Amino acid sequence: HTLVWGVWVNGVDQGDGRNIYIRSPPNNNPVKNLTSPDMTCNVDNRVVPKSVPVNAGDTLTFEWYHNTRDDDIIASSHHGPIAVYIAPAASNGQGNVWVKLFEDAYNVTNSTWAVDRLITAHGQHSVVVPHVAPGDYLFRAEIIALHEADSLYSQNPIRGAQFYISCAQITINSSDDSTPLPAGVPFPGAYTDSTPGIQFNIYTTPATSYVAPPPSVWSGALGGSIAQVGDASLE
Ligand SMILES: *[C@@H]1O[C@H](CO)[C@@H](O)[C@H](O)[C@H]1NC(C)=O
Ligand SMILES: [Cu+2]
């Protein structure tokens, strides 16, 4: 159970984004139905009034939270990977538009999942804005909690992979468009029962062998991290 409070750009807080530049759902409940239009941008996907201005090469930081800002972020139980996708705002998430910019599953050295490191990073993970066509965009942040993913939601609806999905409205102003956005995967659609990383037993399988759901990170992806860039408590 976790939600996006807002974003930082180049380490500067853009302010509370909820229902403003984040297409926020009403609560932090997970999406579990892989075929639901809810997989696109969660259960209240509608245009919101603001779009965050950024330039190619800027660091865009998602800030997640559980109940209040800078709290415990997401229950420690919710071990799993984090991905960020992008699609032109024109799509509104429909069709084969979502290009992956970031993937973090398990870090072997630290022996931590992406979610473990998200909590330490106070809900903050980042991507560098790629050299795509200036225009309006959706950045779709995705946390998969695997603590009930031994079962498939299609077979047993009270279990399954849990998706925490948040779409930020981002306007890329300044970019040379030297890496124009390629063909994307659809959501819903990219993830099925058969897809690697959807069904997994974190208790009996070693995390080292976890493979995260395709697609792979686009060659045009410019960087990303799970790491505090900003201190919310100083505001
Ligand atoms: C999952 O989503 C599909 C497509 O919208 C829907 O028809 C199906 O009823 C859903 N499954 C459940 C159990 O709600
Ligand atoms: Cu939860």
Curated annotation (Swiss-Prot):
Subcellular localization, as worded in the UniProt entry: Secreted
SS bonds (residue pairs): 41-167
Reactions the enzyme catalyzes: [(1->4)-beta-D-glucosyl]n+m + reduced acceptor + O2 = 4-dehydro-beta-D-glucosyl-[(1->4)-beta-D-glucosyl]n-1 + [(1->4)-beta-D-glucosyl]m + acceptor + H2O
Glycan attachment points: 33, 110
Binding-site list for (1,4-beta-D-glucosyl)n: 9, 47-48, 58, 67, 129, 140
Main EC class the enzyme belongs to: oxidoreductase
Notes on activation and inhibition: The polyphenol cinnamtannin B1 contained in methanolic extract of Cinnamomum cassia (cinnamon) acts as an inhibitor of catalytic activity.
Modification note: The catalytically essential N-terminal histidine His-1 is post-translationally modified by methylation to prevent protonation of the histidine side chain, and protect the critical active site of the enzyme from oxidative damage.
Similarity comment: Belongs to the polysaccharide monooxygenase AA9 family.
Name of protein: AA9 family lytic polysaccharide monooxygenase A
Organism from which the protein derives: Panus similis
